[PDB]
């Protein structure tokens, strides 16, 4: 019996939490786990720009014929402009190649498979803490995962001294993974000056930087959120960018991502990109069209794009209002601590500082669901559920 | 530099051709390469049942929130009914779990990863010839791929005696891959009693059967094409099925597939399926929704399903008509080689029996593109291009 001795797998710390929430019978449940945006009414809607783009596709698609291994060309072009800028030298020098992938996760696995099978890379450095699935993706491709310091739990800030010291151990040729913006789970991003320090330190020690870009547009703005990346881009000969449209387009279940490869010249990137296309062929062959077609349609049409940029702005601003409302309401419900640091965190998540035992008690006794690390989804908070949520947090302090 | 030591990847034997075809500048070219269906006008249209389902989705979809790791539940249920039968014992005993995957390739890759990490499987046996990407998928997981004999190139028949003898060294615990129907590229499938012999020999030797089902409904019918699988399923404790809807629904670029796990009992398959979900999570996280929603919508709605089943019949019967017309026109155009074996082969592909040198001559001398193995896509033949391409073949014989 080939399957008789298999060991059951542990639950996913994010998705395993969601199945529990769906099963909970109590009517006043609150879900602050998975990073999914909710509007004021508590729903995760389809954007108007997306619905209009889908209508265009429905009435104009003539075939479902396979896309190329790397996907829709216009999709790749628009992705590189978003990442690097309209008139970037990487683009004009033809130094960058982009493959449409199934989500940001798929972009990470493609890069990992590509590295482990075509290079001498054997080590990937990931911030501590980070998105839980990072370790799983790179380990599954056969790469070793090392951790570098990032979060100061006492000051609720970025420990730039610990980060630099920890990364001194990263040898040349290693891969160092950076969150482009809206660090998951801490919400604390480097300042532009800190980015430039890392970019200079990156070229000196010979690192291959890998950028995970899942939240472009949720910190300050589309262009503003890519400053750190464009600092590395202006200084490195090689780098990898895995990006996702799941969240800034609300296209989660359509799996829309990109893996962008940068090399010193056009000849080397095409040679390396051919091996990336080979790793894709042996995985899922070619990428799903519907989600990437929507994104390409929106970014290619100035009218649709104007709607989307405005829908994304409302998302960013609503999350900022909830951060404020969250802090004020905690003080009002009797919280003794100071939660002001939540105002300075970017993106959808906040490191609340709650212990594992408190997170566990919030779930069992109050029906409030957060990840065991104390990460809470601010974008899951509404004017309606704010008061019960804060009453439960104060009760477990 | 980390990318400068990378060696360029060779051209895909199937996709490297279609790129060389889109470049060709001659009028009247004919492409008998990629395995995509075409109607009598030479186009690959969206099925009417698919447009109807897509219209229903555009109007009723309220969210794009993530699917579960294994995808749409109803999609997995309908898949098992298609494979095993409406009232199979496998389903009632709850011995089967199905994961929605990005295409048939995605299902094969998920199985390869699952087997590599969680079992002592070290070897997959694949027919010679086979779909070229089989070796790449299983190799990507580190699995050794051995080949067994299949095609009698003299009689254009299944060499069943050589098949048996060549699998003598397949050990217990080895994986043996079978094409469920419409064998790619030969179009030669085992008979029902040949299937029965293989099922009986597979259980005595202890093989783990893995069925690749990309063409259900293109040989004889939906139920008849699954008889081989169901003969195995009635005798084996364990088996794997990778199925694809890319071709029988015309959803190529939406990447709609399924990996189905079968074990001895419900507790074992659940335990093993949890590890399969872990391998999906570390690859693309969760599957794309649009294509699978279309399939689930059609198969759950009796009105849409009757339309689709008729569109599939239309596709199947056109291919069989081109097989007849191809043989007849070859005679009309003066061929002395007997091509009657074309009529006996199932699906979209057949080995024409032309040498690599003749294939090269057809391509650069008449504008007719076929794979260098001599495989031709019969679904690429139309009443308008039949006479030109037959004139071309006769010329190089
Ligand atoms: C930092 C980070 N990387 C990658 C992902 C995965 O993106 P996707 O769901 O598009 O695969 C996420 C969360 O979804 C994330 O927060
Ligand atoms: C075409 C084909 C596949 C690929 O299926 P997709 O859904 O396109 O990924 C897999 N196996 C065989 C035998 C095929 O012919």
Numbering used by the authors:
A (entry chain B), B (entry chain A): 0 to 396
The authors write:
E. coli aspartate aminotransferase (AAT) is a pyridoxal phosphate (PLP)-dependent enzyme that catalyses the reversible transamination of l-aspartate with α-ketoglutarate, yielding oxaloacetate and l-glutamate. During its catalytic cycle, AAT undergoes hinge movement to switch between an open conformation, in the ligand-free form, and a closed conformation upon association with substrates or inhibitors. Using our approach, we enrich the less populated but catalytically active closed conformation in order to increase catalytic efficiency (kcat/KM) with the non-native substrate l-phenylalanine, leading to altered substrate selectivity. Steady-state kinetics reveal kcat/KM increases of up to 100-fold towards this aromatic amino acid, resulting in a selectivity switch of up to 1900-fold, and structural analyses by room-temperature X-ray crystallography and multitemperature nuclear magnetic resonance (NMR) spectroscopy confirm that the conformational landscape is remodeled to favor the target state.
To determine if these differences in the temperature dependence of exchange could be observed in the crystal state, we also solved the maleate-free structures of WT, HEX, and VFIT at 303 K, and calculated isomorphous difference density maps by subtracting electron density at 278 K. By contrast, similar comparisons for WT and HEX showed relatively little difference density. Upon soaking crystals of the WT enzyme to remove the bound inhibitor, we observed that one subunit (chain A) within the enzyme homodimer was in the open conformation, confirming that the soaking procedure was able to remove the bound maleate, and that the crystal lattice could accommodate the domain rotation required for opening and closing of this subunit. The 19F spectrum of WT at 278 K showed a single peak centered at approximately ‒60 ppm that shifts downfield as temperature is increased, similar to what is observed for free 4-trifluoromethyl-l-phenylalanine in solution.
